[PDB]
Design a binder for these strands. Structure first.
Ligand SMILES: [Mg+2]
Ligand SMILES: [Mg+2]
Ligand SMILES: [Zn+2]
Ligand SMILES: [Zn+2]
Lengths: 589, 589, 197
DNA sequence: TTTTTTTTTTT
């Protein structure tokens, strides 16, 4: 049999990328610079360089991966001698394997081969340690000898002790020596099939995967991931007598992909358009006709403001939106669109709408009978967007439970001997119906909404949707029929690039307030307070929370255009959208 | 004694079918084409061809079955050698065994004989792996030897390891080698006897069946199946002392039967009649006379519309029907008929059956306390019809969650640290009693069924059934007694032929909306809104959901006649049926 | 059962053709040999005390002269009046109620149609002032019926009326136990104080 | 799961 480590080393250096930049040479440099200890190789670049190298990697994966990794380690050693005695063993990862098998279609013939599975992470256990080379001492007054039990072989998954001391050839008892035992990081996670591939009428299935060494903590629950590795049978309790020769199947993870420079170039190109703000707004729920002002508000909540963390206090940066409208006003349709484009979103309509289900629940751990906290909807949405549907149908005593979360962005529980605090930094978007199902113009605004003023002050923007028959029905009917006919609007930013644009903006753009914006915001707030004092019958309280809503909204407009500071135009836009919200609740200006 | 292998081979190649077409060769070629590895044969054909061969199969299936499989395998590879290196063992399965035993009547004399059982599947375990040929390594410092312990014999259902190393003739410790261990797919299911055959005052019996190799995932739970195989005594733990010399019995499945091109030809022929639409209406619930409008609506519900899946949104294609009938109006007759005629239907009540009433629920594990999901009635009915009798007394928890499932066709969970989304694309047909015993015509519909007005807008059509004590009482009394004696109508379509007709239409007909139908629907919707606007106390809300109902209903009419497009005639019928619905609730259209 | 005591139980074993010869709730006469029961011989340590179980050899549930006697009774033209007069002889009056209770003892004929099923059982509801001998008659009905179950609204649960899940702690297995309504299949279910349930 | 008494959270 011929060798390929020369070709593998040759491929790492002689491969030419998109612009013949030799990224793998650069990738090796990054590995040495940061002591990354792991390298990722695209399969599409292997068969192109040498198709023969591709098959042997796929087929004889067990007996060829250590050979390639050993050759790469020597290549790194000459590139940087100091890499020695820092990372003894190196790993290489292969992605983009053509062998992809659906979870439900896994059979006996698939065990022992390199395969790829796409699914959803649902739970991850904490990082632990696994023994792959143990050291034992023979406790027998003659011996007092120390040795490594698994000779020339990695220690198996089942912990096995020697029965005869190799140093003396006698039985007895042996004591493990933790100080001379080699360990490897170990983690267990469960993957779940996507709902798209689940057959109708069946519950989704799950598979257990094992992450080891640097692969630990590479993903978090609720992430769409693509995993590659080798399947094997699970010997959880081999000592359990009682027949049962039936075994489960678990996966030995070799590489994992979650969810690129070219994306950055595309995103930056979009921001160069002077009307990028208009394009983003037009891309929010293209299938819904009208509701332009509501679409503008939903865009702001997706981007959000800039949270302020000070040495003595913390200031909320998220934006909260409340929508009240008549039935059949596309409230749920627009909300469902948010979960598709938001990098992280949580939906809750009717189940889990109690106080325990929204923030946190104290559940008795049946394993030990004690108590511990279970994360609620708002806690699970931390760092993302929490979507609440049918808020008006929630009980008042249950609804008040989220007042602390909406403003202080924390959840504190003091129940059954547990006192703890959890972070809930999430944006809340809520929808509901008026008090009498449909809006009534005869009644005032206050009783139509039917919400306490305490919770209304926590919402940055509130919109009232009225379904009044008139001359617009013909336009609405034509638009709906055109949608059903397959016609689609053009010049619209699609979904996946919009999601990338929002994700890039949130973690890379931090606008700052200028002196010009300060004067405009201050003047409007003073004017707004005077108008509120004029009419004591208004259902909306103008508190200092409204002033910070203007600051948050203005920052979001700047962040929407990837601008580094808030200018006069951004402040003017924030004031304008505030005027519409005040007018929508009967507060003229 | 006599080698039937030659007889078996010639029987397959010289089987006189319905026209001496040798259908066994046709399926053998099909088996080679797709690598099916499983050939099923009929016991009647074997008996007709050679009754002597049939007796040997039904009497000595333990001995001669592997012999026949070897002969078939040689014939297959001789016919096509490419089958080799892909399948090393073919399977032959017998069906239609005359030895049928009732489940409750099984006794000790039937152990070890080929019998068939009819019942209902209740539980199906996930697919696992079973060891039938293991490889062991002797951990004794002088051996380092590998061997297959079950020498010249398959591994029994009880996992046993060697006591003395065969290669070195010494005892010690042995380690399993998964990489050199043969595995076979293994699944366990439970079959329950039908309620018809259960004796009075007794609980139904159950039987455990084992599915292996390709038989895994051959039947969804809740299906009536016929199972053929061998019975044997279960051995859960042979090492468990404590007397208990009694054992249960389980079944090794060899062939499973659940519950054509000619049908498609007759289905298309049945659609050639221009009066097919009226014929289908008549065929619906032939037992009940009259109620033509209600019969027409139920026919549309079974066919349904065409769902639209877009880039950013999904549009419901199902049709929901609500029936409010007075007591004694026999509202449960066609409901039972609907369940039988529907290709896939679920029958339930308002409260449901399990803890998950209609949508879903989260249940702690009884043994471990872990949280998992239980499918509700709507989820289990995905892709079919959900018949929900007594809708007016659903659980309070489901009164809110049903809003999302009835419109967005999804169930979202964000409780106890679990985030999930389950599809619920199921048409809903529900019946509810009036809240005042007898329906009141002057009162609106919302205060007559005890449901929120928002739910009413989610129903495409609502029908009221009143037991009017008119002249029909004499006819009705005669009609009721005629049903007691027994009577039937003529010139209809049987449920068996109708069921496949609906199934064919739902899988191959996707009507498209034309311009003529588009204009007709637009004018009516505008007219609908104006009439509701004029009346300040309209009993029914006219929302854009009504416009979707017109599109869905019209598409069902085109699908009813297997039309490729929607024409004016389909639109006109859609308008007319909606007009009657508005009259029924008391709206001057 | 003696005064102030709880009913006792005995374990019996049916083998070969004697299996499934009776249903729960039936009154039976059983003949066989008694023997001590051994279940955990390996469980060493005290427990030198054993329980007794019966090895069944024949079982009887609950015939020519009686059939002749029954036929002679039906020959009387006023047999219906005699039967009604024999329902709760210790209660004065309530002739209409007694007549209806006799009908429920016999019942109708069930009919299986093309699609639906027609029950043959008759349901009776009695509303009366306290002290109107409502409970006395129901006790009589539960005693004269060939198969009847007497329940009370306060002393009944949903699990106890239909079916109760019993976890076999020996093997950790779930199996059903027949409830009051199931045990009354083919008979009469008597429920007292239904309004208090 | 099931009946029971108990303190507790949460249906
Ligand atoms: Mg909605
Ligand atoms: Mg009484
Ligand atoms: Zn030693
Ligand atoms: Zn050996």
């Amino acid at each position: 049999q011929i060798d390929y480590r020369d070709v593998f080393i040759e491929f790492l250096t002689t491969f030419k990328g998109n612009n013949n930049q030799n990224k793998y040479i650069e990738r090796i440099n990054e590995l040495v610079a940061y002591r990354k200890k792991s390298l990722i190789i695209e399969f599409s670049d292997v068969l192109s360089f040498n198709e023969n190298l591709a098959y042997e990697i796929i087929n004889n994966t067990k007996i060829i991966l250590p050979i390639l990794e050993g050759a790469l380690y020597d290549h790194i050693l000459q590139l940087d001698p100091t890499y020695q005695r820092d990372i003894e063993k190196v790993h290489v990862r292969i992605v983009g394997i053509p062998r992809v098998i659906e979870l439900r279609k896994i059979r006996s013939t698939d065990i022992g081969k390199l395969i790829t599975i796409d699914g959803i992470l649902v739970k991850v256990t904490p990082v632990k340690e696994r023994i792959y080379k143990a050291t034992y001492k023979h406790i027998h007054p003659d011996c007092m000898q120390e040795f490594e039990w698994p000779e020339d072989e990695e220690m198996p998954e089942v912990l096995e002790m020697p029965t005869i001391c190799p140093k003396c050839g006698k039985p007895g008892q042996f004591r493990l020596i933790p100080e001379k035992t080699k360990l490897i990081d170990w983690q267990k996670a469960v993957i779940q099939e996507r709902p798209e591939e689940v057959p109708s009428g069946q519950l989704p299935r799950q598979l257990e995967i094992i992450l080891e060494d640097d692969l630990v903590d590479s993903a978090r629950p609720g992430d769409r991931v693509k995993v590659t590795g080798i399947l094997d049978i699970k010997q959880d309790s081999p000592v359990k007598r009682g027949s049962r020769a039936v075994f489960d199947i678990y996966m030995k993870v070799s590489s994992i992909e979650v969810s690129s420079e070219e994306d950055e170039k595309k995103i930056k190109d979009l921001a160069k358009d002077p009307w990028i703000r208009d394009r983003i707004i037009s891309s929010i729920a293209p299938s819904i006709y009208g509701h332009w002002e509501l679409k503008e508000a939903l865009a702001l909540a997706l981007f959000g403001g800039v949270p302020k963390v000070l040495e003595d206090t913390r200031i909320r940066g998220d934006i909260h939106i409340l929508i009240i409208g008549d039935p059949g006003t596309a409230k749920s349709q627009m909300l469902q669109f948010i979960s598709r484009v938001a990098p992280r979103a949580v939906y809750t309509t009717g189940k889990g709408s109690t106080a325990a289900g929204l923030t946190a629940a104290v559940v008795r751990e049946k394993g030990t009978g004690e108590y511990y906290l279970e994360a609620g909807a708002l806690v699970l949405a931390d760092g993302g967007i929490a979507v609440i549907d049918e808020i008006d149908k929630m009980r008042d005593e249950d609804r008040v439970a989220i007042h602390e979360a909406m403003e202080q962005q924390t959840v504190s529980i003091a129940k059954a001997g547990i006192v703890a605090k959890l972070n809930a930094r999430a944006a809340v978007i809520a929808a509901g119906n008026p008090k009498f199902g449909r809006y009534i113009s005869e009644r005032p605004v206050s009783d139509n909404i039917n919400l306490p003023p305490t919770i209304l002050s926590r919402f940055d923007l509130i919109f009232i949707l009225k379904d009044q028959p008139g001359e617009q029905d013909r336009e609405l009917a034509n638009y709906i029929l055109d949608v059903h006919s397959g016609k689609s609007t053009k010049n619209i930013i699609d979904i996946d690039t919009l999601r990338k644009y929002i994700a890039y903006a949130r973690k890379y753009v931090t606008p700052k307030i200028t002196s010009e914006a300060k004067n405009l915001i201050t003047d409007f707030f003073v004017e707004m307070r005077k108008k509120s004092s004029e009419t004591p019958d208004s259902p909306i309280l103008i508190t200092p929370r409204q002033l910070e809503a203007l600051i948050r909204i203005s920052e979001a407009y700047a962040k929407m255009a990837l601008k580094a500071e808030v200018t006069r135009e951004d402040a003017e836009r924030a004031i304008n959208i505030m005027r519409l919200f005040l007018e929508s609740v009967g507060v003229d200006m």
